[PDB]
Design a protein around this nucleic acid. Structure first.
Ligand SMILES: [Mg+2]
Lengths: 105, 206, 151, 98, 101, 127
RNA sequence: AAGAACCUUACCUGGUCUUGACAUCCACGGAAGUUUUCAGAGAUGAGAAUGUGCCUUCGGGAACCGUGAGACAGGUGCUGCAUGGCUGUCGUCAGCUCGUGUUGUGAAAUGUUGGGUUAAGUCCCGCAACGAGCGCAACCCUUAUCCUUUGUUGCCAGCGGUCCGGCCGGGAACUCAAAGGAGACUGCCAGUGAUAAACUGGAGGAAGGUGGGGAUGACGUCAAGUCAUCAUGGCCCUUACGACCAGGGCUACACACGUGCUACAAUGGCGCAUACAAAGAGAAGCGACCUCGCGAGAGCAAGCGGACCUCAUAAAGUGCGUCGUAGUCCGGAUUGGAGUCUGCAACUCGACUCCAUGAAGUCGGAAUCGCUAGUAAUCGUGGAUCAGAAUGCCACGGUGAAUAC
């Protein structure tokens, strides 16, 4: 952003821009984590099977929202609801955000 | 035996020449023979003193030998006796008064010839080839280097068949020409035969 | 080739009156890379044919060529089993070149006095369709029209 | 007058050798002509990389010899001896002719 | 590499530079188209056998100086092709790098 | 007054000085008809002179060395095209849509080791 | 093997030498060295004249040479199936792997597969994979266009006079020349494509998509080739398998094969007049000029350890005259005399020019190789090897195609 971005080559500058965009939209949210997470709020258990399969391999609660076609086996606290409709997910997720943020009291 | 010499391929790009002198086609061969003779004699004499390379220049019909080593104290002796001893026993054959000059390096674990000498000296003490190779590579990498690759070949372990074993650590690009790569081979004559040990030390990329 | 879909090269036009077809004809006359001599022979035969038939250098060639210009050629395209011939229409860029090649091949033989005289006689003969290049054309047309069952 | 012809192997050494030998003679012995190119002599060699059969495998080496003329015009006192006993920056065969 | 042959060759060199290159007039100046057409030149060629079968410059094979190899020799460096390649790749010969053009 | 083109093609090197006057060509103290005008490729120098006529505009004092007949002639052609600069791209836009500006290096390849003439292998045989 | 007359030579016959030809130690006697005669194939033996310093521990020393024993030397003798190093090949083919994680009891798998694109696991996208290394590409050299310093033994457009030879004044514009930079990097536009990678086409540009060429050779395979270039484990000879020399052979020929040259002719052979190159070598060598011969070469003898001097006249090509499709003027093999050049010596066993001779051969069976561009085809030039000795090797340059459905 401030140092070396127009030094070597314009093609390589575009290369680095593409690399940064890819790395950020892939692993940009968990950037400032710094350690291991404590809870994994997941939106699906049938589609994102491997996420829970990995989170259950160690002592991390993986309570999540599951629909009818998923396996409520490895999840800690199953939440029955919809996973695709935006309205449904946003209601659940707004409740989640309010409960976590007032928990910062 | 299918690769090119990493030093010969970079003699003009990065790595310089060992002998830097100009002579015309009449005495070129005589000069090269004198250089070879002084080099082999100096090595046979200072084998126990760690010399990696010997630069042989000749300013104005006066030979100058810059000995790059790691232990200059054993080379010069107290009061410097051995240096003038070498000067005499070198000028006896060079034909002119020789000006020899020692130069030490405080990182002997990064020189190809020095590492090969260590491996050969450790092998000639019945040391395990695996232990020696691993210890040398670990020492080099903890002393500082962007990449190393050692290769031993022969009757290691006293076997009847010969197997070549190489161990690498880091980045060692031999096809990149701008890279600074030290390479040199050492022979080791044991009670069972000859063992060759070559080393690629990727000191830096430029 | 297999992947390269490159096309043909752009040859140099003729140093005489502008013409690419007789330039290609000259290019296919040359042995040992001697182009000056080939151009001299081509010009000699062209003048000898124009003065003898009444037409000019560019028109005379055209009449002769079309008499040796083949229609279809047979080539082996085996399809899962038997190996048979397949008569097919040849592209024009290869058709004219092959006509000129047959002309030069017929002229290589039949040595009258010189190469220029050979080629002028061969062109005159193809003009009335009784030479050897036309005989080769008819041999190709006979190889075709007989094995036309494979299509 | 003074024909100075210097030849060496490495150009990125001979060039600065010429620069120093020219400024150490023009700052006090000016009216010099500079580093004339004097094209390079390329001695090539083609050897066999194997000690035995497989002749088709050969190595190709060459040595370049770069030459330069300085061509000083006037035999000055700031020049004749200031050229002598100053033979550092070795690796370059220098020849002075009167 | 047949130290016998190497000593033989150095002996040849010594004896040749000792006898010839100093008395070559017996075959270079006397064998001339001049008044020496008489028995003088006959006695000259007669004494031309005074010197041993050696001593001639044509019996100098010019072997390598490190190994003593008769084939693959280069008069420029005085070494065979094997050793000249080895030295060139090690960096012993000045200016001699891999050629590419 | 007098303009210049360099020109070079296949080991050739030319110097074409171009001046307004007669339509003659004086090349190496020899005229164009007696230099190479009697051999083939007689108008490889006159090719880029019909799109812009030469008969009664200007003449050329030409020198050329290196290469052969056709090489030197192509070098002369390229030198003429480069010397046509007092009549700059205003005419080169037309001179280029027919060639006459492509350097066309395509130098002879070096003979390769083990080969015969840089492409002809030495007659492989199985047994 | 980048070059067998002797030499090289490692083989054979014959004559010899023996701690030995090559290297170190002890003791003894002699300066070393130089000229020369006898016998011999020579190795060698027997001799004859000369020479006596470098510093004085000065019972001699620092070298050299003559001899005796012992440690030893030497071996191109075997073992590449004991090895190092080096090399070829699959193959500049694009693949070979590792760390962590995950699946599987496990051997293992994933990564590295799949949709596209590329010369390329090149790139993009998807995907329990996330990354990395050796590879690819780039970095290196050369060529291709241009810019800057110098302008010579280089050049000379604009000028002075010319035996018009840039020969001489005169210049750093131009060619060439050795350095440092610019540029060519999918840079921009249109379409297609999953708005990605990328492909196609176009504008500028000398050059479009890795511009042309080269070096650069991945883990490994062939238990591949070399212990005859060299180093070395062990087996052996070590009064010999070691060592010196004269001659011979490696060049032998009932035959078979591979690699090239010469041709088989008229886009051509012969005689004459003509024009256009690059790259290189050179001092116990290249060797101007002049004289002699049809000639290879010889005699005198400048310049050059070199952008000046030499090698060194470039040929194909262009014009003229001849040859009329004949085994012919194509072809040049073999043969006898004589001569030139290197070398101590050219029979075995060199090259070269001339005199006479002229063969087979009239485009080649099955089968088989190279090449997609300045490449092929064709023509000539230089260099390493070398006293001399290539049609081979390496490199340079001239003309310069066809086809790729
Ligand atoms: Mg794979």
């Amino acid at each position: 952003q401030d140092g070396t971005f127009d030094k070597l080559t314009k093609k390589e500058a575009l290369m680095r821009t593409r690399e940064l965009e890819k790395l950020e939209n892939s692993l940009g949210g968990i950037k400032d984590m710094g350690g291991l997470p404590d809870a994994l709020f997941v939106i699906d258990a049938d589609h994102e099977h491997i996420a829970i399969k990995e989170a259950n391999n160690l002592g991390i609660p993986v309570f999540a929202i599951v629909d009818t076609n998923s396996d409520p086996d490895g999840v800690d606290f199953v939440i029955p609801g919809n996973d695709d409709a935006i309205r449904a997910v946003t209601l659940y997720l707004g409740a989640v955000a309010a409960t976590v943020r007032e928990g910062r009291s | 035996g299918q690769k090119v010499h990493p030093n010969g391929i970079r003699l003009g790009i990065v790595k310089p020449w060992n002998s830097t002198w100009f002579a015309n086609t009449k005495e070129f061969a005589d000069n090269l023979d004198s250089d070879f003779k002084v080099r082999q004699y100096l090595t046979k004499e200072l084998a126990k003193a760690s010399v990696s390379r010997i630069v042989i220049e000749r300013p104005a019909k006066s030979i100058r030998v810059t000995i790059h080593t790691a232990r200059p104290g054993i080379v010069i002796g107290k009061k410097g006796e051995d240096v003038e001893k070498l000067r005499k026993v070198v000028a006896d054959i060079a034909g002119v008064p020789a000006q020899i000059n020692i130069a030490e390096v405080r990182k002997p674990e990064l020189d190809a010839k020095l590492v090969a000498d260590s491996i050969t000296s450790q092998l000639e003490r019945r040391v395990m080839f695996r232990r020696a190779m691993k210890r040398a590579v670990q020492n080099a990498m903890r002393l500082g280097a962007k990449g190393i690759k050692v290769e031993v070949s022969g009757r290691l372990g006293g076997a009847e068949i010969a197997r070549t074993e190489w161990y690498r650590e880091g980045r060692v690009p031999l096809h990149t020409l701008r890279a600074d790569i030290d390479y040199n081979t050492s022979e080791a004559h044991t009670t069972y035969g000859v063992i060759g040990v070559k080393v690629w030390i990727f000191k830096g990329e430029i | 080739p297999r992947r390269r879909v490159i096309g043909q090269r752009k040859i140099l036009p003729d140093p005489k009156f502008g013409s690419e077809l007789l330039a290609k004809f000259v290019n296919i006359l040359m042995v040992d890379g001697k182009k000056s001599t080939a151009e001299s022979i081509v010009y000699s035969a062209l003048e000898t044919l124009a003065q003898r038939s009444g037409k000019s250098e560019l028109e005379a060639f055209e009449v002769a060529l079309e008499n040796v210009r083949p229609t279809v050629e047979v080539k082996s395209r085996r399809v899962g089993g038997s190996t048979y011939q397949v008569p097919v229409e040849v592209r024009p860029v290869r058709r004219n070149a092959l006509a000129m090649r047959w002309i030069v091949e017929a002229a290589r033989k039949r040595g009258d006095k010189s190469m220029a005289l050979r080629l002028a006689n061969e062109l005159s003969d193809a003009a009335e369709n009784k030479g050897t290049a036309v005989k080769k054309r008819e041999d190709v047309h006979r190889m075709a029209e007989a094995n036309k069952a494979f299509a | 007058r003074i024909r100075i012809r210097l030849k060496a192997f490495d150009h990125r050494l001979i060039d600065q050798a010429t620069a120093e030998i020219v400024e150490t003679a023009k700052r006090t012995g000016a009216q010099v002509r500079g580093p004339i190119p004097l094209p390079t002599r390329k001695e090539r060699f083609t050897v066999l990389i194997s000690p035995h059969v497989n002749k088709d495998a050969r190595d190709q080496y060459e040595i370049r010899t770069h030459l330069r003329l300085v061509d000083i015009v006037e035999p000055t006192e700031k020049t004749v001896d200031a050229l002598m006993r100053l033979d550092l920056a070795a690796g370059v065969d220098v020849q002075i002719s009167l | 590499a047949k130290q016998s042959m190497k000593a033989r060759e150095v002996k040849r060199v010594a004896l040749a530079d000792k006898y010839f290159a100093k008395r070559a007039e017996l075959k270079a100046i006397i064998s001339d188209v001049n008044a020496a057409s008489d028995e003088d030149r006959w006695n000259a060629v007669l004494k031309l056998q005074t010197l041993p079968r050696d001593s001639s410059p044509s019996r100098q094979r010019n072997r390598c100086r490190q190994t003593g190899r008769p084939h693959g020799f280069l008069r420029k460096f005085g070494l065979s092709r094997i050793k000249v390649r080895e030295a060139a790749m090690r960096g012993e010969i000045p200016g001699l790098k891999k050629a590419s053009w | 007054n007098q303009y210049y083109g360099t020109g070079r093609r296949k080991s050739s090197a030319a110097r074409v000085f171009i001046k307004p006057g007669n339509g003659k060509i004086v090349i190496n103290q020899r005229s164009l008809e007696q230099y190479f005008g009697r051999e083939t490729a007689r108008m490889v120098v006159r090719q880029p002179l019909e799109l812009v006529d030469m008969v009664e505009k200007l003449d050329l004092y030409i020198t050329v060395k290196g290469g052969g007949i056709s090489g030197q002639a192509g070098a002369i052609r390229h030198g003429i095209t480069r010397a046509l600069m007092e009549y700059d791209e205003s005419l080169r836009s037309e001179l280029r849509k027919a060639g006459f500006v492509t350097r066309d290096a395509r130098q002879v390849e070096r003979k390769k080791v083990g080969l015969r003439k840089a492409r002809r292998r030495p007659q492989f045989s199985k047994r």
